Design a protein around this nucleic acid. Sequence first.
RNA 1: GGCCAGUCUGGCGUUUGGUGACAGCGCCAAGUUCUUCGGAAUUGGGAAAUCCUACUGGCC
Length: 88
Amino acid sequence: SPEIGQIVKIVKGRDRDQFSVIIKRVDDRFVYIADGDKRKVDRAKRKNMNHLKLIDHISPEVRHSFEETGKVTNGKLRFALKKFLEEH
RNA sequence: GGCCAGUCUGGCGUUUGGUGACAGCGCCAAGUUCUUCGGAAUUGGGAAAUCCUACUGGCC
């Protein structure tokens, strides 16, 4: 099952072939994603899990942001995705 | 495999919408119908839907 702060690669939709971050879990089928750059948290995108590829990387920055504040900022989403690309 | 609900000429751009196929807006291209021959108007197949191919979402 998906986790808050987990990296996904979008496989369907107009934003396909981008990496994004799961920022909310609705149920086991639907989540919300955002990247803090072109898709910011105030425009988070509803996605069927079948249209994402789960990646084995959860950003601690995003996960810690939600643990301490219940939210995530656009700056932390951008930083998490940038760190993911560099390491992986 | 079965059923329900969807999408429509091809291409690419887009921090627009859509879970998605896609759509919107844009321009490029093809077919077709026009022309004042500069350029306009259109759009899967089919005479037709409770039809069909392809594709998408859900259920079994």
